[PDB]
Amino acid sequence: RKVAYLTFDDGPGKYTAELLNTLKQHDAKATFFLIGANVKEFPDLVKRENAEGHYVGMHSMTHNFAKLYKNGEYVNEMKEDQGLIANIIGKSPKLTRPPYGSMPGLNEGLRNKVVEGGFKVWDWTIDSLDWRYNKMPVDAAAAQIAQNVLTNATKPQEVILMHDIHPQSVAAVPAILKGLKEKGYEFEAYHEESHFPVNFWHDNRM
Amino acid sequence: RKVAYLTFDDGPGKYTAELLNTLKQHDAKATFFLIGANVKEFPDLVKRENAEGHYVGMHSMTHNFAKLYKNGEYVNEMKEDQGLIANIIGKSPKLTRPPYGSMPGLNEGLRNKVVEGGFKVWDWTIDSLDWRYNKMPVDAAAAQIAQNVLTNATKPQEVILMHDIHPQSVAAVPAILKGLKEKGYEFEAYHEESHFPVNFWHDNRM
Amino acid sequence: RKVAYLTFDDGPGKYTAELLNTLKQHDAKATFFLIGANVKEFPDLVKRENAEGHYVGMHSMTHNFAKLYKNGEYVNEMKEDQGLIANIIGKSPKLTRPPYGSMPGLNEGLRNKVVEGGFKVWDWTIDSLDWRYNKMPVDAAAAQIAQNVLTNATKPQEVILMHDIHPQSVAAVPAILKGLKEKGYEFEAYHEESHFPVNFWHDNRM
Amino acid sequence: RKVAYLTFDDGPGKYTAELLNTLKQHDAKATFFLIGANVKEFPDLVKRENAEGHYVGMHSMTHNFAKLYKNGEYVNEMKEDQGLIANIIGKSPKLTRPPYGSMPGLNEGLRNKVVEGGFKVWDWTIDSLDWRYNKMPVDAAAAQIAQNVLTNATKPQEVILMHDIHPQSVAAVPAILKGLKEKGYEFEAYHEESHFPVNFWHDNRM
Ligand SMILES: N=C(N)NCCC[C@H](N)C(=O)NO
Ligand SMILES: [Zn+2]
Ligand SMILES: [Zn+2]
Ligand SMILES: [Zn+2]
Ligand SMILES: [Zn+2]
């Protein structure tokens, strides 16, 4: 079975509800990796993401490279971001998404602390590259991002990276949902029991 | 449609002429990010890079993290570097490659300055790790450096980070050239007219 | 009659148990040079190395060059390390493995004191370089590290230097085991009564 | 095609005239790498070595790892040793043999200085392991030593590392000298305009 894991970073944002509506019409499940401050400011959308069948994961508190990796705060920020989400959805997620991917920031020491604290790490297999088209005419941008994604969809499992804080990304998800559904894909959320490694370190403990 | 951008950093140096011959024999173009100290010491090598169809960009004066980022000399140092390079080749190139990468050093202050100065910032999407392989037989090191590069070229555009100031790096270039070619890359150089963003801050202004 | 002596340094550590299993699966015996702080923290791992047919040697307390050599605490530290290990496994090992190798730390005075104290000193005849491969996917590093050891085993007795305190290192050992055994090596531990000299000073009193 | 390049280090010494007699007795030609202070002390042996058709090359002034490599004095000591030898044999040898081998002592920087100062660098392809048997019965010691050597002789050219300051090494030579004539080998000395690379770095500028 060819599965497509849509993943969404740095949320929630002002386009998130738009996106949740779009995904529901297509009976598509997804994963969100939320930043701490956005959880505080959008508790509703967070509750809604869970309620509508999507996995809710963490993406830290600061999204600051020096704190997370150089100063080794990764696991602490994931844990605090875990609390905020637990307070809303009533369960403590295990799946983290490292800001800026895990390579090279998540060294051998921190990778131990992630395993030792119960967390999994998921990077991705596809960069939609949606940030390139920021502040550009949404329509044209989005269809380009769909190209970025659709034409790299090759292997049975695919973990796609998108940012639902950007309009062109959210706008792209329509056209990505059609073309992937074509090539035999299914759009599921990440399931914690069904975990399989997807990380730049090929580190199978996460 | 696939294009690989070999980029060589910290040069020019005593191996740089050898690399220039290898590039020319294979009809391949690359990009060089130079430390001004070497611009001065090897001005003929700078002049030849530009003359053989390669891009000549800046990589600062001091290559000192503290001066560049903590003290905020990045844009200064890149313009000094720019001036020196112009005197030799007649162009004031706009592309900068930050020492130690942009993340975490190029903060938002400097990033604004970069844009207000009309400069451009390239990081990389493939790290050859070439300079680390310096405690082994050069040919064996070059094999492992090619292997790194060859097995990470997946995207239609790869910005491969190397350093022309180490023997194992230049020795690695032929295997690299041959491999990517079988995978379908061309080895164009950077063109300023065709700039597409490549940093770690996902800042598509630079 | 060819014999590979796998040696692991700076342990025990969080991957030592996994490595201990993997040795067991292949009936291979090895040698562990331990740091005193680690000996104190993982006492049961020490016991398990010993109880499984491995030689348990010393690698100082501080792994601090200036304290060991410029200050001459080498024999002191290896003696305290010996004391700590004996309390666990019942025997006072004699063999030490110098942090940073013996050249040039183990000066003549210290080499004399080594011999006066009944200690033996081993450096190695093959550097895996394993610990340098900590910025790449762990499988990939492990394959390069295997390649290193395999392509350098040519002498009837080879002492391979590794570190069991790194994931890529422990991941390299299976491919190292298979390979050397293709080349007809068997994997013994160090044996006190069968001591032969292996050091950079060519001092056959050690 | 058969060639065996016997090389002897750290000379001249007490047994060098014996060795020189042994080689002459077998029409064998060899290579000596001389330490500076031994050249000062044994001018006749140095003179005699050149006069009888063997190559005379340098092996440094101090034979000191930290001065040569860490403090970067290698080339200076080789040039100084070179002067001493020129003052006796009326030419300046190009071939140096690094104390302790070139790996990892001779880094990329020092390998440039050696290239630039006009010097070549020969390691070896066979370690006699002669130093193991020091202060042991010269008879048995030598026989073992011929064995280590003869055993690993299989490639068209061999560069054997021996030490003519040791009695067992010298005594071993008769047994080696036609252990190798049968296998085919002929015993030539090194000649500069016939130079081919034999170095642990596989650096072919050397
Ligand atoms: N100490 C270091 N080299 N830092 C690691 C990254 C260096 C960066 N690729 C660079 O400066 N390239 O020129
Ligand atoms: Zn993010
Ligand atoms: Zn640099
Ligand atoms: Zn160590
Ligand atoms: Zn020597």
PDB file of C-alpha atoms and ligand atoms in Angstrom, chain C residues 9-10 35 59 63 97-100 161 163, ligand 4:
ATOM      1  CA  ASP C   9      38.346   2.617  23.997  1.00  0.00           C
ATOM      2  CA  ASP C  10      36.752   5.145  26.381  1.00  0.00           C
ATOM      3  CA  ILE C  35      38.028   5.122  31.671  1.00  0.00           C
ATOM      4  CA  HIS C  59      42.596   3.749  29.648  1.00  0.00           C
ATOM      5  CA  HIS C  63      41.859  10.949  29.603  1.00  0.00           C
ATOM      6  CA  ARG C  97      46.194   1.810  26.307  1.00  0.00           C
ATOM      7  CA  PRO C  98      47.284   5.448  26.350  1.00  0.00           C
ATOM      8  CA  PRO C  99      44.736   8.137  25.617  1.00  0.00           C
ATOM      9  CA  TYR C 100      45.825   9.887  22.370  1.00  0.00           C
ATOM     10  CA  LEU C 161      41.489   0.683  17.392  1.00  0.00           C
ATOM     11  CA  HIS C 163      35.638   3.327  20.368  1.00  0.00           C
TER      12      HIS C 163
HETATM   13 ZN    ZN E   4      40.751   7.273  24.261  1.00  0.00          ZN
END
